[PDB]
Design a binder for this molecule. Structure first.
Ligand SMILES: [Zn+2]
Lengths: 81, 144, 155, 150, 129, 87
RNA sequence: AGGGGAUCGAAGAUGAUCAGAUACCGUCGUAGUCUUAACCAUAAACUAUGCCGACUAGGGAUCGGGUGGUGUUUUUUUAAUGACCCACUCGGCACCUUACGAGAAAUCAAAGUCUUUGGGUUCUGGGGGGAGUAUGGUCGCAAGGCUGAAACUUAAAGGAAUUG
RNA sequence: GCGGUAAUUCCAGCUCCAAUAGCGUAUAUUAAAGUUGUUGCAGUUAAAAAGCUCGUAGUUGAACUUUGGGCCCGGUUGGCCGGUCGGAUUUCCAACGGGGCCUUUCCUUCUGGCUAACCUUGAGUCCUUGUGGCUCUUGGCGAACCAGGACUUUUACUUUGAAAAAAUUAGAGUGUUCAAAGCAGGCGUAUUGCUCGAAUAUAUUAGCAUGGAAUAAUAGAAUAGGACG
RNA sequence: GGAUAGUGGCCUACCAUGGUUUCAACGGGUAACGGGGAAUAAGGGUUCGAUUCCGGAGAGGGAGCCUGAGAAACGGCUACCA
């Protein structure tokens, strides 16, 4: 304060603020491949559903949406990127 | 920006809004509406001359306590009637009723002068000669 | 404006003196007269191809384009062979140092050599008085119909 | 801003600097564009379709993998609707609201909200009509509004 | 809504100067702002600024020294008829010997002085001292 | 502030804060001057030798003089780590 | 214009009181108060503070949404749910402390960034009284609403603070 | 605000002050007046935010599209010298602009009328070891604007200029003895003329003419009813 | 078409239904002839201009017209009102 680095802000507190208030804005939403042992085939899913996503060929379930991120369907697993 | 449209094209709004606001300037409202010609006992003229109707003695406003000698005058130009003070000491002596005095303002534009209520005018030239030359001793009152 | 009939008045509609002889066998029927107003205003194809008469037509009539040459937006097309255009402008007021929006509606004669509608920015040239309020004549339709076909429907 | 309320909230979508990529993305434009038009035949709005393709499918944004925006795809394959999406849903709401009022005229608030919704409608359509996509005559009236949806 | 960005940026630089800071996060950015700042550093009331590129309208980071009292914008970009530049500088400039009025001419966004030499004129942007 | 044929005129070329470059004038009794001893090898601190700083009244009141010391008197050499220009 | 009419209660009638007491106080109680259908369009309708935008300072709360935790508490077998804790961030109704700054002051996160005077835009005001009066116009069933002068008079009116 | 018996304001004496062939007064006007506020007012409590929201006219309205580099040409100050009989110009040399360049880069476009301009050169040289210099016709620059055909997105803004009665005004010269004025006048050979003037400027909006191409509008190819050939 | 010295709803005949307007039409006011100009000096303004220069209008009011190159003249005529 009175002097700092606007061009180079510490990642420690660049990740506390808002998605639009950062140095150059961007999303806090990740994509993840999601798998259920019912099938041998995984499914790409967005972390904030809105739409209750269904699986591959097994019409079972994957996620039911919420106020933000999607709750996952218990007996499943997931991996980012 | 406190209201006033600052745009490069709002000239009309600004001059109009001017006129509008200008009407709350007393001397301007007066100068346009007429007043000086409508109202006002003179013609808007600097002076006006009339006939003395009766010699008056006005009790003066507070906290002053005396009697201020004036005359009621009926202007020759327009027949309006106006009570006007006679300045200096005496000088209500020089007048008499039924004469021909020349009246002027009291340097206030309307507005009664001192403690003289409702008197906005004064004597400046009675019977033809100046009231001053009469109160000193220069000139003397014409014929009758 | 005009359209159809051409000969549609109590008096015969003929261009002055432009005589053609019935003895003289013809394929053109009536011999036609035209010119060019000058000032690089290309005398339009429809003026020479035309069949109308208009003696107030700058290209095929007996008037002359001279003086001021102006342009404006078309606000009115109702009166026959004459329209009303609105030239806008800004007036500089020094006291407030600002320009204020103003306009003027010039009445201008339009030859049946044009196809003017309301909106077509247009270029007119001063002439003689031809009427009570007419001192100009349309001499170039700069616009078109303002992308009017662009607003259509489906398929 | 926010017009018909002085509610100054901020709640959008922060777009990545990555106008290209996802880099972790295989497939092609082929697949996902077929997805778009097919879902369009299924009868979904560009917003709906975008959300769907963004969740169940692997499309962060369907403007980058395919150099064209969804509604433009729909227009391209001849799937565009009578009026744009936003004007449609505005009008639709206005119609349901109106019905609510004609079910009880004692609700002043409802009349307020109807005035507002309709003002919004008229402004919008004035824009659309400025840009040739709403026919130069097109206007909203209730007595053709309740028909306009169907 | 944001009426004139140049105004905002200049107010940001100014509040920066006053508050005691040396760095100014200004947003958004545009060619006009750039040229302004460019004729600002050319006479050295600021250090150097860095255009950071969000893929939208932009950002700028102005490192200033503190030689600047106050810079401003004449928002109604009035037209200046070569005789009127004298009047404007006379208006908002602390003295003849320094401080410069900056304006937009058909010869570019230049200070009153360069404008005087080049013998060009136009609308007015603001001022620096 | 010189005159005609060169030559200095106008007395008094005032101080200046090291932190803000804001001019320091007479009635600002809130300003300050900080003398740092220029010490020598192992222990001793040479008198008649100071790293002298100046911090104007504004900053002193704002309470940035501390941070302006960690700023100035460290990249002037006489402190290590402590303050990072990135925040 | 119907309904309804408990309650309390302009009017009015009364018992008191005071010199007087058409009041204050008590008793009676019309209208009103509730309501549906239509009017009316004014309140100190007040934060006595136009709206949109940017910037300028630290703090503990709390409302609403979200995020982050091998945090507490609930046990069914470890969870899952649910409340609580801490952190962080949006948008709130608020306070606290300070003053860079502002004001005539009281005070003010604006009432700040404003003679170093220009982001955008709407509105109103120009000494006091006359007077929200007169006149015209429009609205209303009415009461009244909007629009709204002048003649004349006047050296003050008024604001905030201090000591008495 | 003074006067109701010691009146620094009244009636006078005396003295004194300001202005001076003039001074008072009444009315109006301008300044004062940032009390009309574009510059530049004010509106919590002193005058003054419409009870509230919509919303047409009006005012206003995010950012982005030829940015950057290299080469020449000649005009004006200003700097050490002077090459001189107060002022002259080369170049040593920075400063400050303007003209044309080539960088994927219409300038309306054909059809020749003009070519001044050079990648040209034809013998070389007056002459500093020569790219310092230009007289000099034959393969060889389009714009330098012509005359004629053929077509052109519209603006605001600014620039220079033309067109612009005199009196007025700002202002140069001239000693009406001075001044306000006037445009006179000044010189010998004053017995047979000599001669300088009677300037310049403002002349702001609109029309014309032109240089600019930022700022700010505008129009364009999406049912391609597009672009060139 | 007629009329003019000639353009023109200038007038007539037919025909059409158009023309200005909150970017303020139309109407009212003016103790309003317009301009060159003038008064007031930071600037921006404000106020003024019947009046020696230019342009217009009238010759108590109105209309009409003779003469003539030119007048709807008035130190011209004609009629009406005062
Ligand atoms: Zn599955």
């Amino acid at each position: 304060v009175l002097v700092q680095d606007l061009l180079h802000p510490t990642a420690a507190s660049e990740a506390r603020k808002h998605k639009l208030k950062t140095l150059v804005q961007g999303p806090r939403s990740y994509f993840l491949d999601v798998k259920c042992p019912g099938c041998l085939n995984i499914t790409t899913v967005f972390s904030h559903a809105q739409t209750a996503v269904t699986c591959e060929s097994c019409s079972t379930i994957l996620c039911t949406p919420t106020g933000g991120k999607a709750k996952l369907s218990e007996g499943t697993s997931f991996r980012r990127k | 920006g406190k209201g006033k449209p600052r745009g490069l094209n709002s000239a009309r709004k600004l001059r109009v809004h001017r006129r509008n606001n200008r009407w709350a300037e007393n001397n301007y409202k007066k100068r346009l509406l007429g007043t000086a010609f409508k109202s006002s006992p003179f013609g808007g003229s600097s002076h006006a001359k009339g006939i003395v109707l009766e010699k008056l003695g006005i009790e003066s406003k507070q906290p002053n306590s005396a009697i201020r000698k004036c005359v009621r005058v009926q202007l020759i130009k327009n027949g309006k009637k106006v009570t006007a003070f006679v300045p200096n000491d005496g000088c209500l002596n020089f007048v008499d009723e039924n004469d021909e005095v020349l009246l002027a303002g009291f340097g206030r534009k309307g507005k009664a002068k001192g403690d003289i209520p409702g008197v906005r005018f004064k004597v400046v030239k009675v019977s033809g000669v100046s009231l001053l030359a009469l109160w000193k001793e220069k000139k003397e009152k014409p014929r009758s | 404006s005009t359209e159809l009939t051409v000969q549609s008045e109590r008096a015969f509609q003929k261009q002055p003196h432009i005589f053609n002889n019935p003895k003289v066998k013809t394929s053109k029927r009536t011999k036609r007269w035209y010119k060019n107003a000058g000032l690089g205003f290309k005398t339009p194809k429809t003026a020479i191809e035309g069949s109308y008469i208009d003696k107030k037509c700058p290209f095929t009539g007996l008037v002359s384009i001279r003086g001021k040459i102006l342009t404006g937006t078309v606000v009115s097309t109702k009166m026959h062979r004459t329209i009303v255009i609105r030239r806008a402008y800004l007036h500089y007021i020094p006291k407030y140092n600002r320009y204020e929006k103003r306009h003027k509606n010039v009445p201008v004669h339009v030859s049946p050599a044009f196809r003017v509608q309301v909106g077509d920015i247009v270029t007119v040239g001063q002439c003689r008085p031809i009427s009570k309020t007419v001192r100009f004549n349309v001499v170039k339709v700069s616009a078109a119909x303002x992308x009017x076909x662009x607003x259509x429907x489906x398929x | 801003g926010r017009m018909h309320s002085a509610g100054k909230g901020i709640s959008s979508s922060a777009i990545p600097y990555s106008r290209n990529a996802p880099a972790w993305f295989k497939l092609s434009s082929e697949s996902v564009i077929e997805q778009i038009v097919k879902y369009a035949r299924k009868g979904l709005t560009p917003s709906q379709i975008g959300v769907l393709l963004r969740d169940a499918h692997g499309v962060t944004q369907a403007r980058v993998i395919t150099g064209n925006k969804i509604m433009r795809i729909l227009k391209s394959n001849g799937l565009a609707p009578e009026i744009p999406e936003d004007l449609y849903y505005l009008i639709k709401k206005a119609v349901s609201v109106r019905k609510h009022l004609e079910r009880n005229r004692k609700d002043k608030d409802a009349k307020f909200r109807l005035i507002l919704i309709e003002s919004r409608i008229h402004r919008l359509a004035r824009y659309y009509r400025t840009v040739a996509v709403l026919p130069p005559n097109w206007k909203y009236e209730s007595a053709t509004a309740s028909a306009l949806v169907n | 809504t944001r009426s004139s960005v140049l105004a905002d940026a200049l107010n940001a630089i100014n509040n920066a100067e006053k508050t005691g800071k040396r760095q100014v996060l200004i947003r958004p950015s545009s060619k006009v702002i750039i040229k302004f700042l460019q004729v600002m550093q050319k006479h050295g009331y600021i250090g150097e600024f860095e255009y950071i590129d969000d893929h939208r309208s932009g950002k700028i980071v102005v490192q200033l020294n503190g030689r600047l009292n106050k810079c401003g914008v004449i928002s109604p970009r009035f037209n200046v008829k070569i005789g009127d530049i004298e009047k404007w500088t006379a208006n908002l400039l602390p003295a003849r010997q320094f401080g410069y009025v900056i304006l937009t001419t058909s010869a570019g966004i230049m200070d009153h002085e360069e404008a005087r030499r080049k013998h060009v004129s136009g609308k007015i942007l603001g001022f620096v001292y | 502030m010189e005159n005609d044929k060169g030559q200095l005129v106008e007395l008094y070329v005032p101080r200046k804060c090291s932190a803000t470059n804001r001019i320091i004038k007479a009635d600002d009794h809130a300003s300050v001057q900080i003398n740092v001893a220029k010490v020598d090898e192992e222990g001793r601190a040479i008198p008649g030798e100071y790293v002298t700083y100046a911090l104007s009244g504004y900053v002193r009141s704002r309470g940035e003089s501390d941070d302006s010391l960690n700023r100035l008197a460290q990249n002037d050499g006489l402190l290590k780590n402590v303050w990072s220009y990135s925040r």
